[PDB]
Amino acid sequence: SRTVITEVIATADSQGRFLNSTELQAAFGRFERAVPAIEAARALTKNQDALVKGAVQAVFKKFPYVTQPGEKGYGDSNQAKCARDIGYYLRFITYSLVASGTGPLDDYVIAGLREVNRAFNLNPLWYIEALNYIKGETGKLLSGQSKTEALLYIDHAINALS
Amino acid sequence: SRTVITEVIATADSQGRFLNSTELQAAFGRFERAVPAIEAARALTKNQDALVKGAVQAVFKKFPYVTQPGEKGYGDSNQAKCARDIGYYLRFITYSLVASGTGPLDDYVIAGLREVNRAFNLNPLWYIEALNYIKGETGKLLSGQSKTEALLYIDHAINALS
Amino acid sequence: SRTVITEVIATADSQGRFLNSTELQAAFGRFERAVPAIEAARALTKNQDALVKGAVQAVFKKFPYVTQPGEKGYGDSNQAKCARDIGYYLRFITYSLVASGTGPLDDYVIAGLREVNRAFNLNPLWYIEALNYIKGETGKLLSGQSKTEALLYIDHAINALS
Amino acid sequence: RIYKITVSEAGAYATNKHRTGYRAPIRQSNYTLTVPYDRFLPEMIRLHQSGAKIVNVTSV
Amino acid sequence: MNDVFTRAIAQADLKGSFLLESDLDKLASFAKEGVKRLDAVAALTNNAPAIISDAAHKLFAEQQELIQPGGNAYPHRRMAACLRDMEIILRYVSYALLAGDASVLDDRCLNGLRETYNALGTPTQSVARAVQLMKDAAMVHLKSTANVTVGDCSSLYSEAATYFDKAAASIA
Amino acid sequence: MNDVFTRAIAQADLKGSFLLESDLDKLASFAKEGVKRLDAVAALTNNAPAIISDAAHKLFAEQQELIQPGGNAYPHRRMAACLRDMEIILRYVSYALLAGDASVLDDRCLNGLRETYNALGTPTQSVARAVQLMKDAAMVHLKSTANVTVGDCSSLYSEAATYFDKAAASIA
Amino acid sequence: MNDVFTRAIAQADLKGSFLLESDLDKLASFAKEGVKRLDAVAALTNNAPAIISDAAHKLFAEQQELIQPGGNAYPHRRMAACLRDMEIILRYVSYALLAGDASVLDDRCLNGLRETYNALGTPTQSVARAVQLMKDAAMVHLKSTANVTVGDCSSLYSEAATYFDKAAASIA
Amino acid sequence: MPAVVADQYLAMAKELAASRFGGFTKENIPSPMAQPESYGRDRLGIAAVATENPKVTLRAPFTSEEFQGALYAIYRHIFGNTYVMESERPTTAESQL
Ligand SMILES: CCC1=C(C)/C(=C/C2=NC(=C\c3[nH]c(/C=C4\NC(=O)[C@H](C)[C@H]4CC)c(C)c3CCC(=O)O)/C(CCC(=O)O)=C2C)NC1=O
Ligand SMILES: CCC1=C(C)/C(=C/C2=NC(=C\c3[nH]c(/C=C4\NC(=O)[C@H](C)[C@H]4CC)c(C)c3CCC(=O)O)/C(CCC(=O)O)=C2C)NC1=O
Ligand SMILES: CCC1=C(C)/C(=C/C2=NC(=C\c3[nH]c(/C=C4\NC(=O)[C@H](C)[C@H]4CC)c(C)c3CCC(=O)O)/C(CCC(=O)O)=C2C)NC1=O
Ligand SMILES: CCC1=C(C)/C(=C/C2=NC(=C\c3[nH]c(/C=C4\NC(=O)[C@H](C)[C@H]4CC)c(C)c3CCC(=O)O)/C(CCC(=O)O)=C2C)NC1=O
Ligand SMILES: CCC1=C(C)/C(=C/C2=NC(=C\c3[nH]c(/C=C4\NC(=O)[C@H](C)[C@H]4CC)c(C)c3CCC(=O)O)/C(CCC(=O)O)=C2C)NC1=O
Ligand SMILES: CCC1=C(C)/C(=C/C2=NC(=C\c3[nH]c(/C=C4\NC(=O)[C@H](C)[C@H]4CC)c(C)c3CCC(=O)O)/C(CCC(=O)O)=C2C)NC1=O
Ligand SMILES: CCC1=C(C)/C(=C/C2=NC(=C\c3[nH]c(/C=C4\NC(=O)[C@H](C)[C@H]4CC)c(C)c3CCC(=O)O)/C(CCC(=O)O)=C2C)NC1=O
Ligand SMILES: CCC1=C(C)/C(=C/C2=NC(=C\c3[nH]c(/C=C4\NC(=O)[C@H](C)[C@H]4CC)c(C)c3CCC(=O)O)/C(CCC(=O)O)=C2C)NC1=O
Ligand SMILES: CCC1=C(C)/C(=C/C2=NC(=C\c3[nH]c(/C=C4\NC(=O)[C@H](C)[C@H]4CC)c(C)c3CCC(=O)O)/C(CCC(=O)O)=C2C)NC1=O
């Protein structure tokens, strides 16, 4: 996936050249960023369940009409799919934090997202609200540099939803 | 010129996208590496006279025939050309250190280097010996990671010549 | 605009020859049943205002949450913009009817529709419901092949919104 | 002979790009294409078909 | 493209002299504030859709001519082009902020934009007003001290204002 | 093309699972040995001309039939393609060494290499010999204690050896 | 790509004489029923999102291994690819229905499609199942007697059934 | 009641189920067809030419590195993947470019 190391290697390769000093400094920056990013991944993995259930409840609070019958969020199966989707998003955010790139989000979430949302009439505002709750909670589960990394990736997902 | 910020902007721009986590990680790595690089630039700037004089002398030691009549090292104009060229190499190396990238060396030295040397019958091995002397003397001048930064740039120049 | 006459001429020019039998008499296919299209456009034009008000009411009935404060529906200004948008769609349906081609729809509505709705957070299902209401009302206002013509154009817009 | 054609893309080109889409990156409006005599007619026909408007044509 | 480091290097190359101590000091200071610069760039990037939305809403509240039929942004395609242009100018302003030199913005985009807008019939004043409203919207996000370590970043505000205003001057 | 991190991510995704504590520990260990990895990659990159030069010298001393009329390195064009191949294999070995995964070799470097050499009638045993000689020459520069901090980098030695052996085994 | 008329003409040309009176009666009858044929093609065109949403929902109900991690429709990319393929195959079936012949479908759509899916690791039997479900939804929409003059169209239903069944058989 | 399992195995079970959302349910199982997202392009060997290498674009003004990389990509595509020697390199054409 498109991560710092992979971009480095692929850009150098498509230009038929070795890895220069700039590319190695990018790699060094990635290796330094690994510590806060992996600690943030640890924090979001540890608290995944409360995070996702709170995010689903936040979605239902901002979008009360959804739970009523005849629309998307009525019924146990639909809400279970909701929790599964937000779990997917959180999982891929943690993958991005580990890889230090938007690669996993781009490959697994961002690509083809709008077409799927139109095909199944899934409103992106739902997922944006869930990610906003995740953002608010990771503001209280992390601190310092890890907080900034997690926020970076969550905002990346939000910006690509809107 | 090819710098870390340059590669960031170019890669994010060709894909028509805003900057993101991987790109800012590379920029952070560059800004972190800046301090040893500017340290090395200051160190090489203070010792340009001794470094260039010693490099010229090392070239004449390694290729004595150069100084004999009928060859390239005969005449004070040619000696001044030699010292001038080595001063150019050192100056562009410090430029590379400051910009944190092989951009200056690439644009101002490497591009066109082969055909220029072929046209004027300049032997690359002369410049490789000069740069090897400078590489040796950076160890006695620099210590830490500044030495490593200077060495990657000098080795880049040497590889470009080789 | 992608009119059938326009496509006649475009195919002629692309293949770079004169207007042959297939192509002239394909234009004749248009010229035959343009009259039902013109009559449908006229009938839509007279009953335009009731159609627009009914479609706005249908949008509000199918999406009652929208009218509540804090979102798009709230405000007489937004009510008016809803009416204006439904009027725009109806006007361009009439244009496509009289032109006997969807080109007015594909250049005044469809081209850039998704990006505009995404940037202004306009749910395409609102306009789909309004168009479905207008479809129901043209079912009773229009009879004969004229109705069929109108319906297709309406449905085309619907298929653009999904 | 060589012909320089200064073409400025216009709304007729913009509508075509809005329908078809940018399989290639977006570029500025006005630019010049240098063609030989042999290619000149196909080049003009293509620019006309795409909706592009020629600012002028010069010879050299 | 060109950055501030490359700018200093190019100037020192024209005189054929090494980078003077003062130039090294200035570039080292720039590398010291590069962290704050990264925060500012991320602030612009992470709120780009919100900046564009607020600017467009404020503009079309100001100028109803563009929306109404016959305006320069009336149909959906021209609205989409308007929004895409504001998007692109924000992206280039953010690139210039990261670089610290407006070369990235001045060479590729601004040189042809005057001619493009003149040919297409757009009112350049409206585009400049859109860029100014965008600057006002993005200033709010650049001010935000939430989630970032509180400090002084008035230099970054001034540089971002320079980028936005001289971009507008290129359009205006 | 994957690194170690994206390989771990793909495995966890196949499980449908967040990364485990132990997986994150192994990944943080990989990223903490990163500077030694960078030094090894720089040693490969910086000494590449020497590596290809002495490898080619040894190979054409051992296998003189390659440079005879009728050999596969005889005219300058074939010799130049030979040196380009050695250059390329070394470059992709350094890519793999930085990535920590040998996915770049089989995705890119060796994607059709054996079929290529069989079509051309190149003796694949000589290419294996050339890659082995490049491994031998590389190991001297990797182990060089000169001008880097002293420490244990034997895992990097083994990893580079495995990458070279993978190239050799895929060719032959 | 040829229609019913060009098919008749090619068969006549192969034997090398004029179209017989029976052939011309067949083709005139086809043109007389072409109005109902246009109704059927309109039914397929206006209801494509409905048909494909229904087919996708049924398909991912019957086959859950497709939409779960590791499945071939798991991430949004492959899910979008699946729905896109459904759109494409429905499009070519409607083309063939208008043509009165399945030459456009076979020649332009289904010819290397099994080979493509086999190379990508896509279950061709699942694709065939999706085409069957999409045929069922399409046949529900074709039979709709609203907005259209009532009359017999059994030949058209059977023909659309053969086009979908041929697509399924060609994929699987 | 005495413990029925050792605490180490309880910890292992808890942390295996902690890495799933929802732990172990019938609805959230991994797909038996264990295909990564990059399965197809990786098994075909077309990952590089289809998704990874960027589309190289060259406009009227450009720097040295953009020009040189564009030339490398052009020569690696147009001339197949065949080695073009320096004597074969077209100089006037790229000067006009
Ligand atoms: C597929 C292309 C095409 C052809 C080949 C064609 C021939 C054509 N011309 C017609 C009428 C006509 N055609 C003409 C044109 C002629 N009057 C003068 O003599 C001039 C020589 C010429 C004027 C340029 C006129 C005046 C009529 C009768 C007007 C009317 O229908 O009320 C009709 C209607 C008669 C019928 O079908 O019962 C046909 C089919 N129409 C077509 O759409
Ligand atoms: C000629 C083609 C064309 C169309 C179709 C069009 C639609 C359109 N309506 C808009 C405003 C709006 N449109 C609505 C519509 C909503 N109001 C609610 O009562 C309903 C649920 C719903 C309508 C069914 C609302 C609330 C706004 C204002 C909020 C915003 O700026 O996004 C906007 C944003 C800019 C503006 O017009 O002020 C567009 C582009 N514009 C065009 O140039
Ligand atoms: C390098 C970066 C770059 C820029 C900056 C750029 C500008 C640009 N804007 C264009 C169209 C346009 N741009 C606008 C936007 C204006 N209309 C007003 O309402 C607004 C106030 C204002 C936006 C802020 C509009 C309406 C069009 C469509 C013109 C038309 O179709 O008549 C076009 C024509 C190409 C096309 O539409 O496909 C270009 C080239 N192109 C580039 O490649
Ligand atoms: C991957 C991308 C990346 C980001 C985003 C990043 C943010 C970042 N913000 C920091 C603190 C800071 N952040 C800021 C900027 C904020 N302060 C004010 O509130 C302004 C409103 C605002 C600027 C828009 C400042 C002034 C500091 C203090 C650093 C200093 O100057 O001493 C630091 C240094 C603190 C430390 O780690 O010990 C970093 C590295 N680093 C990265 O590698
Ligand atoms: C068909 C065209 C063709 C040519 C021309 C050719 C020349 C050629 N000579 C070589 C070796 C060599 N050639 C020389 C020639 C030097 N010896 C000294 O007495 C002289 C000053 C000088 C020659 C004028 C030397 C020293 C080497 C060994 C270089 C080395 O091993 O590094 C090599 C390297 C491979 C090898 O060891 O054989 C080539 C490719 N090969 C070809 O296939
Ligand atoms: C610009 C690109 C760049 C490079 C090249 C780079 C290398 C680099 N090598 C380092 C030390 C080192 N370098 C090596 C590698 C060597 N040790 C020897 O035994 C082996 C022959 C050889 C490979 C095994 C080792 C073992 C260390 C010490 C380990 C450590 O730093 O934690 C350090 C940390 C210095 C310290 O904290 O004391 C860096 C940053 N960093 C960069 O940003
Ligand atoms: C790898 C990343 C990935 C994501 C994120 C993803 C989301 C996703 N969710 C889906 C279903 C769904 N998802 C939802 C979510 C809704 N439930 C309501 O309670 C909430 C308001 C709301 C969530 C916030 C619903 C209702 C469905 C069922 C829609 C249908 O009828 O098909 C579907 C359609 C396929 C299926 O039936 O399972 C996808 C593709 N798929 C992916 O491959
Ligand atoms: C825009 C393209 C176009 C359409 C849409 C079109 C529809 C169309 N359908 C017609 C009649 C008809 N349409 C049908 C078809 C229906 N029978 C069953 O209900 C089926 C559900 C369904 C088709 C599968 C039938 C059986 C007739 C009566 C026979 C005839 O008049 O040809 C007629 C002749 C006038 C009439 O009797 O009302 C037209 C023009 N013509 C066109 O040029
Ligand atoms: C993915 C990276 C990549 C690789 C690995 C690669 C290898 C490669 N080597 C080639 C030719 C060649 N390769 C060799 C080298 C071999 N023959 C000698 O015996 C040596 C023992 C041995 C080298 C150590 C030679 C001599 C040729 C030229 C064959 C000929 O012209 O007949 C060719 C054919 C290109 C052409 O001739 O136009 C390719 C594609 N290309 C790439 O883009």
Residue A125 contacts residue A72 (beta carbons within 8 Å) = no
Q: How far apart are CA G47 and CA C47, in angstroms?
A: 27
For residues G83-107, one letter each, b for 16 or more C-beta atoms within 10 angstroms of the residue's C-beta and e for the rest, the string is bebbbebbebbbbbbbbbbbbbbbe
Let me know the angle formed at the C-alpha of A88 by A85 and A91, rounded to the nearest 5 degrees.
155
In the numeric block, which tokens belong to residue F20? 């485990």
Q: How far apart are CA G59 and CA G44, in angstroms?
A: 20
Question: What is the number of H-type helices and E-type strands within chain H?
Answer: 5, 0
Q: 3-state SS of chain E?
A: CCCHHHHHHHHHHHCCCCCCHHHHHHHHHHHHHHHHHHHHHHHHHHCHHHHHHHHHHHHHHHCCCCCCCCCCCCCHHHHHHHHHHHHHHHHHHHHHHHHCCCHHHHHHHHHHHHHHHHHHCCCHHHHHHHHHHHHHHHHHHHHCCCCCCCCCCHHHHHHHHHHHHHHHHHHC
In chain C, whose CA is at the least distance from the CA of D18? C111
Which chain G residues are closer than 8 Å to C139 by Cβ?
A: 147
DSSP chain B: ---HHHHHHHHHHHTT----HHHHHHHHHHHHHHHHHHHHHHHHHHTHHHHHHHHHHHHHHH-GGGGSTTSTT-SHHHHHHHHHHHHHHHHHHHHHHHHTSSHHHIIIIITTHHHHHHHHT--HHHHHHHHHHHHHHHHHH--SHHHHHHHHHHHHHHHHH-
Could you say which ligand is closest to the alpha carbon of residue A155? 4
Q: How far apart are CA F159 and CA F98, in angstroms?
A: 10
Residue type, F15: K
Q: How far apart are CA E101 and CA E3, in angstroms?
A: 5
Q: Count CA atoms within 13 Å of residue C107 on its CB side.
A: 16
Q: How far apart are CA H24 and CA A56, in angstroms?
A: 20
CB under 8 Å to H37, separation ≥6 — which residues?
A107, A108, F10, F13, G74, G75, G77, G78
Q: Count CA atoms within 13 Å of residue G165 on its CB side.
A: 7
Let me know the angle formed at the C-alpha of A102 by A97 and A103, rounded to the nearest 5 degrees.
105
Interface size between A and B, measured as CB pairs under 8 A: 81
Question: What is the number of H-type helices and E-type strands within chain A?
Answer: 8, 0
Best of F147, F148, F149, F150 to disrupt the B interface by mutation (most B CBs within 10 Å)?
F147
Which chain E residues are closer than 8 Å to D25 by Cβ?
A: none
Q: How far apart are CA E82 and CA E86, in angstroms?
A: 6
H/E stretch holding G25 = helix G21-46
DSSP F155-167: HHHHHHHHHHHHH
Residue C77 contacts residue C137 (beta carbons within 8 Å) = no
Cβ <8 Å between G72 and H30? no
Q: How far apart are CA G113 and CA C133, in angstroms?
A: 40
Residue F97 contacts residue F122 (beta carbons within 8 Å) = no
Which chain H residues are closer than 8 Å to E108 by Cβ?
A: 59, 61
In the numeric block, which tokens belong to residue B111? 């591009």
Q: How far apart are CA A30 and CA A13, in angstroms?
A: 19
First and final C-alpha spacing in chain C: 22
Residue A161 contacts residue A113 (beta carbons within 8 Å) = yes
Q: Which of F148, F150, F157 to mutate to test the pocket of ligand 6 (most atoms within 8 A of CB)?
A: F148
In the numeric block, which tokens belong to residue F17? 């699972």
Nearest CA to F89 out of F166, F10, F11 is that of: F166
In the numeric block, which tokens belong to residue F56? 């080619």
Residue F114 contacts residue F65 (beta carbons within 8 Å) = no
Residue H94 contacts residue H62 (beta carbons within 8 Å) = no
In Å, how far are F98, F103, H38 from A8, measured between CA atoms?
A: 10, 15, 19
Three-class secondary structure of residue D59 per DSSP: strand
Question: What letter would DSSP give residue H58?
Answer: -
Question: What letter would DSSP give residue A66?
Answer: G
Which chain D residues are closer than 8 Å to E81 by Cβ?
A: 14, 18
Residue type, E156: L
Nearest CA to E39 out of E112, E118, E145, E113 is that of: E145
CB of C130 closer than 6 angstroms to any ligand 2 atom: yes
Q: Which of A102, A142, A148, A156 to mutate to test the pocket of ligand 4 (most atoms within 8 A of CB)?
A: A148
Q: How far is the CA of H56 from the centre of ligand 6 (A)?
A: 35
In Å, how far are A67, A101, F18, G68 from F11, measured between CA atoms?
A: 35, 17, 10, 14
Q: How far apart are CA G29 and CA F36, in angstroms?
A: 81
Q: How far apart are CA A37 and CA A147, in angstroms?
A: 9
Cβ <8 Å between H38 and A107? yes
Residue labelled with tokens 């630019």: D31
Q: D3 forms bridges with which residues in the sheet?
A: D35, D59
Q: Closest Cα of chain C to G147: distance in Å?
A: 7
Q: Is D14 on the interface with E (CB under 8 A)?
A: yes
Cβ <8 Å between D18 and C107? yes
In the numeric block, which tokens belong to residue G49? 């999102």
In Å, how far are C106, C161, G21 from D18, measured between CA atoms?
A: 10, 16, 50
Q: Count CA atoms within 13 Å of residue F125 on its CB side.
A: 4
Q: How far apart are CA C67 and CA C58, in angstroms?
A: 12
CB under 8 Å to E75, separation ≥6 — which residues?
C107, C108, C109, C111, C112
In the numeric block, which tokens belong to residue G164? 């979908």
Could you say which ligand is closest to the alpha carbon of residue F69? 5
Could you say which ligand is closest to the alpha carbon of residue E64? 2
Helices (H), chain C: 4-15, 21-32, 34-46, 48-62, 64-67, 76-99, 103-105, 113-119, 124-141, 145-161
Of G66, G70, G75, the CB nearest to H34: G70
H/E stretch holding D32 = strand D30-35
First and final C-alpha spacing in chain B: 22
Residue G129 contacts residue G59 (beta carbons within 8 Å) = yes
Structure obtained using: cryo-EM
In the numeric block, which tokens belong to residue B149? 């930064």
Q: How far is the CA of G69 from the centre of ligand 7 (A)?
A: 13
Q: How far apart are CA F16 and CA H29, in angstroms?
A: 8
φ/ψ of H23, rounded to 5, equals 65, -130
Q: D31 forms bridges with which residues in the sheet?
A: D7
Nearest CA to E114 out of E31, E161, E171, E165 is that of: E171
Residue labelled with tokens 């309004």: C130
Q: How far apart are CA E5 and CA E3, in angstroms?
A: 5
Mutual angle of helices E154-171 and E21-46, in 10-degree steps: 80
Q: How far apart are CA G143 and CA G129, in angstroms?
A: 21
Q: How far is the CA of E49 from the centre of ligand 3 (A)?
A: 18
Q: How far apart are CA H51 and CA H38, in angstroms?
A: 10
Residue F141 contacts residue F50 (beta carbons within 8 Å) = yes
Q: How far apart are CA C41 and CA C88, in angstroms?
A: 14
Which chain D residues are closer than 8 Å to C107 by Cβ?
A: 15, 18-19
CB atoms within 10 A of CB B62: 15
Q: Is H25 on the interface with F (CB under 8 A)?
A: no
Three-class secondary structure of residue H83 per DSSP: coil
Mutual angle of helices B21-46 and B124-141, in 10-degree steps: 90
Best of F6, F41, F44 to disrupt the A interface by mutation (most A CBs within 10 Å)?
F6
Q: How far is the CA of C116 from the centre of ligand 2 (A)?
A: 9
Q: How far apart are CA E153 and CA A145, in angstroms?
A: 19
CB under 8 Å to C36, separation ≥6 — which residues?
C144, C145, C146, C148, C149
In Å, how far are E10, E103, H46, H62 from B92, measured between CA atoms?
A: 11, 22, 40, 21
Q: How far is the CA of C82 from the centre of ligand 2 (A)?
A: 6
Nearest CA to B5 out of F131, E99, C63, H65 is that of: E99
In the numeric block, which tokens belong to residue A35? 């510590």
For residues B100-117, one letter each, b for 16 or more C-beta atoms within 10 angstroms of the residue's C-beta and e for the rest, the string is bbbbbbbbbbbbebeeee
Residue type, F166: K
In the numeric block, which tokens belong to residue B95? 């430029």
Residue E104 contacts residue E92 (beta carbons within 8 Å) = yes
Q: How far apart are CA E156 and CA E34, in angstroms?
A: 10
In the numeric block, which tokens belong to residue A14? 């498509």
Residue D5 contacts residue D39 (beta carbons within 8 Å) = no
In the numeric block, which tokens belong to residue B46? 């203070």
Nearest CA to E2 out of E100, E91, E97, E94 is that of: E100
Q: D58 forms bridges with which residues in the sheet?
A: D4
φ/ψ of D24, rounded to 5, equals -130, 150
In the numeric block, which tokens belong to residue A162? 């809107």
Report resolution in angstroms.
Answer: 2.7
CB atoms within 10 A of CB D25: 11
Mutual angle of helices C145-161 and C124-141, in 10-degree steps: 180
CB atoms within 10 A of CB G38: 13
CB of F42 closer than 6 angstroms to any ligand 6 atom: yes
Q: D54 forms bridges with which residues in the sheet?
A: D7
Q: How far apart are CA A99 and CA F13, in angstroms?
A: 13
CB under 8 Å to E15, separation ≥6 — which residues?
none
Three-class secondary structure of residue D52 per DSSP: coil
Largest CA distance in chain G: 61
